[PDB]
């Protein structure tokens, strides 16, 4: 029975407790009293005193008594009661004849655990497995003795230690003997393991660092209690362990280990930095090289993970270089590694380096040469956005000023060599307001003056419109830059020392900067002397002057113009001559606006609030000026023809102004109340055919655009966009300036405004019913009688039709409908009518055919003879109410006959129409010949002279 | 920023460390310095001194400062740093204006854990949640103060305690202040919880017992260090807690709890038993009632589990009643609960109760009345197999003797009332040898004598053969029972005092016991005086005497027969008269064996080794006796007819011995070498027809058995079983006893052995070729000449055929073949033959027809006249070599004629055959009539007298 044998062995131990036994026998006794599992509660006490005696004897054994694989199972059995099988294999071979409920067993195990805790077996086990004496190695590395290292640092022993560290006996670390000293010697033995494995290698370090990390994690609360020199010892042990590292990966891992250590042992950055600055610089260089390589590159997922770790390592060491006293070290760091560090697109580390630079500057005055070197090296790099940080790092006012001027010169040079990348960087740098706030609270006045001068120089030297525009805008901002110390004019023209002719070029750039790029509030209107001295300006600065001439009215504008243009002779005379009644400027601006509306061309005036253009002329106060209103009606006329080109779906300036004007006067006006439906059919068909012929004459892109725009063919109006609504709105508003008193302004018959009024009275489409009724009322004021009111309206319509045919598919149609409206009218003639009234109904017929001039004869297509022959031919056909019509026409022809002679041009078939004159003379001689004789003879004489 | 506010609060604490603050403010400060997570390694020291100050102040707070649900999260935060959300909800409502890496946080948490360990916050938390002072309740139950209990024992507080017990602060139980005292007060507070929840209830106890078990599991190593009175306090606390339990389930659970406790606190059975015997008895009664109910019965799987537990509870408490000093208690336990405990079919608990009974008997002398009461109560129960255990428990020799005699009387009474169950129990009890070894080493001689007397009484009084057989066998065993003290005759006939006529009946029971039940070695042959005085015995004890008469030859048998039959007059005369030449016993035994082989009946002689029966007669020495050999040949003859009944597939004694005997002599013997193939066909067909007629006359079971046995019909032999091989083997062996000298024994012609020898010489099938050639050689010795050798063989065959037809479908066939063999033979007759030789060839013809007796005439079927008429008829047909045949037959008939007159019986058609006599007389008178005249006249005179 095993229990009896165990009892006998226990008795043998109790009576032989003062004797010394070989370790093998002790191990055999231990094994045999563990393997028994049928113990009783009665004999537990004697056996526990037995095994405390055995454990006390075992601790006294020399370390070389057993091997680690035999040391392991005995501890297993005496701590948790687990029995390893190969252990029982080895132990059953030992003879012991010379020495001869599970609750009892677990009580025995726990009591043995308590006794093993009291007698401190863990230290003995560690010393045995590691083949070293922990106290001796701890003492020797207290004394820095590294050439006499005697310890096993094999990976499997590290595995065994790690497999130890997790049981519960270490949960009670503050209960074993000299637990602080034992803790210290464990820490130093782990450090000596790292040292041994580092020295041997002169996968290889993973287990060592792992077991060291586990040891420090379990041991931090007790290392700092007894020995206050632990921190310094860790500092020296690593100040070698770093220096013995061959490769950079090793270095970064172990520096991570001491980042951890300084975290555990509560070591602030100041002490470590002041005691390890020399090696730290090398370590920093190697690790930052690793960061650079890993950023360049940025089982294959590790390439990011390690990246993060290494970066965090920097984040720690820079935080340990927070109070780095060596200014030279941090200066050379900024000079060499900071550029690429910024290039790594990492902000935290740069950010901290910046603050430690500012702290080093506050505590110590670094040489200006060093700081200008680092600034230029940063200026050299295409990173010019963060430079302001190191500019704020400049604690010297003079250095700050010189650094700012060097940086501005550098960006000027960057814009000079014309590389897109640098230009983009400069644009981003000038997109923030904190930069300019810092520039204001750093730089002084002279810096602003030189910046303005150089910057106007680059603006005038820049051919690229974008670069010049940016230059002018930022020049405007630096002109209005408020200095904090001085808290405004910052650049004067005299200091620029530039020729005036090139300063004249800046006007367009100023237009672009002040209305295109900038908003209304931040717009800073300025005018170069080319504008202030001339009226013959392009519409760009014409619009500029018209819309920012209110800015000179304010005292601020006049003041800054005077102070900026100070030193230039005659400036006062210029100012008074533009304050003087600019009226010609208004005329030319409105003329250009008229012709630009006449050609269907896009202009930036449309983007402005032109709908209240009448308000604009009210701001200056020339709304009462009469010479403007003429031009005003011109505007109206032109917008009218624009509307026509909108309705025709024609677009483009392929036809002259008068053609489309007379086509506009050709519309729904009461002139076509008299016409019949067959007439409409023929005119619409011919208009559609000629419009289609024009359409297929165009290109494919224009046809696609017109098809997209047009929802329906003639006469349906195409789709309406937005801008035409604005144009129409301001067009109808003109009436605000058309009041012009009661009747006296329009009483002059021979005025363009009178022609406009006659046009608007009857049927102009683009004008709304309110304007139409106002025009009708004012015409009622002019002509109280309605008979003359309609007579003059009809005469105006026909006369406009006739005059429009002077400067040449549409002319022939107009010929046709002129004939046709005459045919319609002829039914309404009275027998008692006069020849002058008939000529008036025919238009300006008498005055039209009496214009005998060389120019009128020149290049005429014979429209006059063509008309005369056409009506004469139709009346001749009728002759071969009707009698009254023929008689009145014959009266008219007899009255006019003596004038038609001068007209026959010598280029057209003059003789053919001379012969064709036979019908009119026949209808005259049917009755009239007796009263009109001299005319007849003179007519014949010039006719024969023509031969 | 929370960190600045926490720093300010920490400063406020440091300058106000000597002031007292309300607990709410302290909790708010704790919460706010926990919630901060951006701490620095620099300020860790000041904050840890801050919270040690706060914890020291908090410990000083009165227990009613907070509620448990507020006490919980603060401990959570200060031990593991986990923050409960509702806690932050409650704490954020407190204003603190008047007081104004995660590695740092975890260091803070671990340092706070260490400080909380040092200041012992766990005791304060327990006192707060349980609304009690642990020291006061521990002291009061040291002083046994139960009427002033003030504690909360709610289930949720138990849940909270259990949820506490598992963190790591309790891993260091030996580090908090007064950890032994705190351990004691925890144990006593848990006990007071059980007490409170037991008293309140005057599901309800599960959490309390669970938390108590967890507490004792974590707290056992420290409860016995300081206070040595813990064991007694647990004893009293349970000596009430058991006594206050209303139901038995509660009782069994809590007694399990103290089985556990005595296991943990190292309390041996002796102390607990001597201090708690009164209540333990009640507890034992209740739990054993539970075991009885659960055995009777033996989510529904629990009915077994609890069962086991409760049984284990008994296994513990009985082991704590090991040294129960009260003999009355254990005696009454055995008297009342032990029977049903045995009935529970559980052996461990009974087993231990038995040993504790023996220990109580060794230490203390229990009254004999108690032990006889418990024995009779066990004897009363049908469990009489284990009684021997309590008989060995009897330490008193006189009591042991009286208990043994009471038990034997009890089993005698059990066998008397004739209930099968009790008989089976007695048989099982007598099936073991340890029981009889114990009976021998316990009882004395007089016990054996009275057992033998009563047991012979029951054997002779038992009508059941099985009960009597068991009685006789066990009487034999108790007769040979060796007593250890006396170390053999144990029962004598005189003491039995039984009448001799009933003792004569025991013979058959002795046969059954000594050859059927018992083996050869343990067979104990005995013979009742009925056998020793008589020869007219049934074959049972005949076989017994023949096979165990060797047992008297040994001195042992004679000695035990004399000493057992001592006191009976004339025993010596009986012994000498059976030692005297038993020869008649042999004759009668062999006669019975012969007739039993003749009827195909199963007998147990077959199971014996009868194959060496010749050896048996050699053992006695009567193998030389001549009067046996006659009977021997009888045996042979009978086995022969048995073989015939085997070959015929007939079986059963439906035909007489002589019929089958003459059919056996009818077989392949040389008598049928003379017969031809048509004769074989007719005889085989008729035999098959009559055999089938016999077959379908039988029943279905016999036909099924015969069909299974017979693999083929006639003449193919059926399948051969085993026993016939044995019978045939001993049959052939007879020859060993047939040597009988050279020629002188068989020289007597008129002997049965001579008939057997004549039969074996020619053709008996069952005898092998060795016996056949031996018989031929011995017949060559008897008859050197071969002519007489074949003549007598032929005469024997025909004479056996004729004699077999005297005591009547097979007879008519025999008639036919007798005629037919005569026809065959008649061709071999010489002209010079004599009438006597011809009669010899015809068989015993002359001697056969001359037997004139009243018995021969009586009931004769007229076979003689039938034969005479049949051959006379065939020879008459031939008459109407042939002449020689007719002449020889006529000579024979003339010689015999004067004798055939006497035979005609008066029951059969006598006159018809008298008339049919005309053919023989005709063939006689064809020639012979002159030499035979007086015969003719006498024949005619008796013929006429017959009329």
Residue numbers in the entry:
A (entry chain A), B (entry chain B): 2 to 101, 117 to 218, 229 to 324, 364 to 552, 561 to 654, 657 to 883, 890 to 961, 972 to 1018, ...
The authors write:
Among the >600 human ubiquitin ligases, UBR4 plays a particularly important PQC role, being an essential and conserved E3/E4 ligase found across eukaryotes. Aside from teaming up with various ubiquitin ligases, UBR4 activity is linked to two specific cofactors: calcium-binding protein calmodulin (CALM1) and KCMF1 (13, 16, 17, 20, 21). The architecture of the E4 megacomplex is conserved across eukaryotes, but species-specific adaptations allow UBR4 to perform its precisely tuned quality-control function in diverse cellular environments.
Although the nematode E4 complex preserves the ring shape of the human enzyme, it displays notable adaptations, particularly in the dimerization interfaces that result in different topologies of the ring-shaped arena. In line with this finding, we observed well-defined extra density in the central arena of CeUBR4, closely resembling the elongated shape of an orphaned subunit from the tetrameric ACADM complex. According to the cryo-EM data, the bound substrate not only contacts the ZZ domain but also two long helices in the N-terminal region. Organism specific variations illustrate this principle: in plants, specificity depends on an internal AtUBR4 ZZ motif, whereas in nematodes two elongated helices at the N-terminus extend into the central cavity to capture substrates, presumably recognizing the hydrophobic surface of orphaned proteins. The functional importance of the ring architecture is emphasized by its conserved shape and dimension in CeUBR4, despite pronounced differences in its helical scaffold and dimerization interfaces.
